[PDB]
Design a protein around this ligand. Structure first.
Ligand SMILES: [Zn+2]
Ligand SMILES: [Zn+2]
Ligand SMILES: [Zn+2]
Ligand SMILES: [Zn+2]
Lengths: 340, 340, 340, 340
């Protein structure tokens, strides 16, 4: 007969025994270096320049493009469940708005600044973050100002972006989050806020390690920000570029970032870990991007994973890797799930 | 008129300028610290105890359960395209096989050892890795031997697992990969190989940082390994347990691991980065698990991502985070994609 | 009788046993931290100002001095076998060309810029690196502009070199590689590219740790760059000067280098290892120089080593020591050897 | 006219200026972290079991196989020029000497122990190192005792090697240098010396990081040590195996090594640098092996390099990389060159 063989053992070495630390549900919580709380959540808003908009974005589940006259009813229940922060993205749809230098990015009449004034008035305790970039405002869809050859013009771009950021701060935004990845834009934005006497009031949340890749699809629908001719690979970091990401983190810290974003999130958890050493004294934020989000919904719909389960697994992942803040389209779900 | 404002700039600081390093496609390759090659790929095989099997696994796209009489035709084209390694999982379906101590795990008549002898004869240059565990062989589906209260019995389990590993080595396997996560099993497996005069011939590839979670669904179908009563949370590591994972990596290195696996992969890239310091002198392997794989297919089917694109993005992610080996169900695709 | 004595042993300690990790050919590959691929290779070209040249260089085996009208036939088969990058060296032989300030270094009529325009037109996917220095263009053969006492004039030299580098970039070179070792030339070259709006397009590949020594003999024949009166020991680093090399690496990184070269290679592998810490976020390139190359051929011809074997041994050495790029006269051989 | 362009400069930054440190020949000496002295040199001797031998080794320039009756005349002038240490290799040519367990390795009648007694008597101040291995004594030419399948038997090999080392110590050798690379042999050799009351008298100089490769050709002629059937790749380290080398250095230190050898030398300078951290408290020795030596002679004969120049360049390389001792076939040359 084939019988079950058992090799002769030596006494257990104490160094082998890890199991005492995780044999109860409370312990598996004790083992986290950071626990998820509601105040860590940052929820993106896509604000339309049609005040009555509430448009479904087909590729971005359960997220809409919203005008100002619809914001109050949308946000009231979220704030009531403990939402503490939002990140605004403007989506100007009125024709003849977009141009080569993103003039409308800081249009006082535009959806972001209108959105800021609305939220400061109706939800004065909400912390307002504004994305800073030109892509939702340029005729060509790139994140900066271009040379004639279509490559990015660094100096003009950071000059423009610094203006936009300061103007959002002047309108009332508490935080600016430059998502452009153009060399040296943090220095100029910080200098701009210093010159405007707003640097002591305005958190600079840099998208310091933001990678090019395949996970921004549904965002392009929500924000109508797809590039015209070419792609973003000469400024967004290459997925394999750990060295570049490390240098970008150091750079933006040095140039005045109060916090940094790693983007995408799950697919770049190692870069959050890198950032947790380089930027150990700064808050680190994970951005759970449109494609990562839509991927979780697609897999859950197919029965591969359970939505709530993998949402907790992925978001706990961010905290494990060193983040303490999360920008996520699942914020409404978590404001309910974290009660229980 | 609202006009485009441009703040006054200072001269560019050289420290700001990263763009010289990634403005051409060849450079975005120069920026990787490791490039993907075919010899890094390890392909899982699910071997049936019905020699004529070639059964589709509904939840695991394009992967089948295969008996020995079908292996040659399956593997010939893969080896011809450069496959260098396989990892074997036995799936014994004959009734009255499974028992409380996983007797059949090392049945010389069983699919793993038959699979080893087949591959050594027909594909003598293929490197054979065998998964080592009891879950595919226990009546209760857990990875070790249980006490009456249903908790894991450490000493009996590692005694049994050491036997299994040595027996696979004795049959011809080049490498054993214990996936059980039971405290101290590497020491006993290594001592077992030393006593059998096989330690100088047998690579010990420990699943050192293997987490409990929501991503093993489709594997349970392929391997018929689902637990009976309870789950694996008292031995698989808690997703938030970075400290435990760090300690597990150190432990298994100390107890004789020649290499380590981090599992799952994408959702645990930060742990690969941790491992790349702790286990800097050892090969690190990412396991792209059944649920991560099925998730990529589900999202691609929904048009969220492009399959090939995100496959390269995710697998490049592993290398970026410090892995130099990848166990992946996408090995056949990559053996074609890496030619081009 | 003298008989074979065997001392009494203790049981094997697991910590002693390394052999599990390297007992199979696939494993000895798993043990490399980086594998050699074709896209890592950079091949030097010596371009003549006689368009029809294809002159053998007696001291540099299998390498010729080539004019532009012969380039297409020379490069077509190499690119077809996967060559991705070249490094250009100009060799102007027309009398009355060389002068004390290396005027011809950036002659639009000269072999480098002609070579750049030829390659951009006929091989538009090739990545073009240009050596930047004055030695192939000065009447005196030194790498910079001299004072009357014959010592290097730093300020004038870096002023001239910055111009040359920018002019090559303006002509189409993707990368400039200053090989002069004159203090602070990287800062000025980078500032020059920034002022010319080319820094976002031009990789600066500094020969940061370049040593004086006995291994440049055959290069002096190919490039007709031998100094007049004196040697290069006051700017090329002394072979024993680890401290200086460490400081040079830090300096050039700080002044804008996107990548660094260690030169020579095999005889300075320890400096590559130093560089892999100091410049961990940057690509590191080994230059397998003329004398190291000619040394391998001489020893192989004498039957001391096998050419292919020691070529792989030495080039794997570079990767082991932390390089991820290799400038090597053996590129044609490797474009064939890496297929197999 | 094409005229020499000079870009506008900024004032020199002090951080750019390294040249103050190496503008004079005395300074290029000040810049070495260690200077070459005669007492750092260790000279290999190949001792024949024919007492009157003085046989030229065709592939090893200027080195002979020497019997005991010729030793005095050979060594007298070397010691007179300051030779402080030798490393002995036995070359028994009498038929019926070699056997599967290397019985003759510690034959009191054999060339090593005769060589030890000769040198202790006639040159009592010379420091005697003995190579410890079985390859010059086994019928099959491998470095240890084999199983029937021809693979190395670890336990028997280290048992035999420990005996040999202790027996050389008992005969008068001051130092034993095990060159076998078999797992755990240092522990057993050290325990053997402790049991023999010789550990307080006997330096253990481990060849801890000894690589397989193409550079041992001429040694095989001198020592008649070429393997029978197979090669040494399952115990000598793979050239790409930095991780293994790091682990081997740590291991042998832990098991009792008083010093370590890195072998080969020039082609592994990065491993010396690794060793200088891992083994910072221990002397590190470079072995300039037969093929590296013969390579320098071949290139010098071809006029690629100047022999003396490259000998100093390479040996200074060892010291730069962290060695403080050098085993080298060029010791006679250096005992003359270091006077001047
Ligand atoms: Zn943008
Ligand atoms: Zn299991
Ligand atoms: Zn030069
Ligand atoms: Zn030996």
């Amino acid at each position: 007969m084939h019988t079950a063989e058992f090799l002769e053992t030596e006494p257990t070495e104490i160094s082998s025994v890890l199991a005492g630390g995780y044999n109860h549900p409370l312990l598996r919580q004790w083992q986290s270096e950071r626990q998820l709380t509601k105040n860590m959540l940052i929820f993106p808003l896509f604000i339309s320049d049609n005040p009555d908009d509430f448009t479904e974005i087909d590729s971005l589940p359960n997220i809409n493009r919203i005008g100002v006259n619809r914001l109050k009813d949308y946000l009231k229940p979220l704030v009531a469940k403990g939402l503490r922060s939002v990140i605004l993205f403007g989506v100007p749809l009125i024709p003849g708005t977009k141009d080569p230098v993103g003039t409308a990015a800081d249009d006082p009449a535009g959806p972001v600044i209108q959105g800021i004034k609305f939220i400061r008035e109706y939800f004065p305790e909400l912390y307002i973050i504004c994305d800073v970039c030109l892509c939702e405002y340029t005729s060509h869809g790139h994140c900066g100002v271009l040379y004639d050859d279509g490559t990015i013009n660094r100096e003009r771009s950071v000059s423009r972006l610094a203006a936009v950021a300061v103007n959002y701060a002047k309108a009332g935004a508490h935080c600016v989050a430059p998502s452009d990845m153009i060399d040296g834009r943090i220095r100029d934005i910080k200098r701009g806020l210093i010159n405007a006497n707003l640097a002591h009031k305005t958190f600079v949340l840099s998208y310091a390690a933001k990678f090019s890749g395949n996970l921004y699809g549904p965002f392009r629908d929500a924000a109508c920000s797809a590039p015209s001719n070419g792609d973003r690979k000469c400024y967004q970091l290459p997925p394999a570029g750990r060295g570049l990401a490390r240098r970008a983190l150091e750079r933006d810290m040095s140039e005045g970032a109060d916090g940094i974003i790693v983007k995408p999130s799950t697919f770049y958890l190692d870069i959050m870990r890198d950032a947790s050493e380089i930027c150990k004294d700064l808050p680190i934020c994970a951005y759970h991007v449109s494609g990562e989000y839509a991927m979780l919904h697609a897999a859950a719909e197919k029965g591969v994973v359970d939505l709530k389960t993998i949402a907790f697994e992925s978001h706990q992942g961010f905290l494990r890797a060193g983040a303490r803040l999360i920008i996520t389209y699942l914020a409404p779900e978590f404001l309910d799930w974290l009660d229980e």
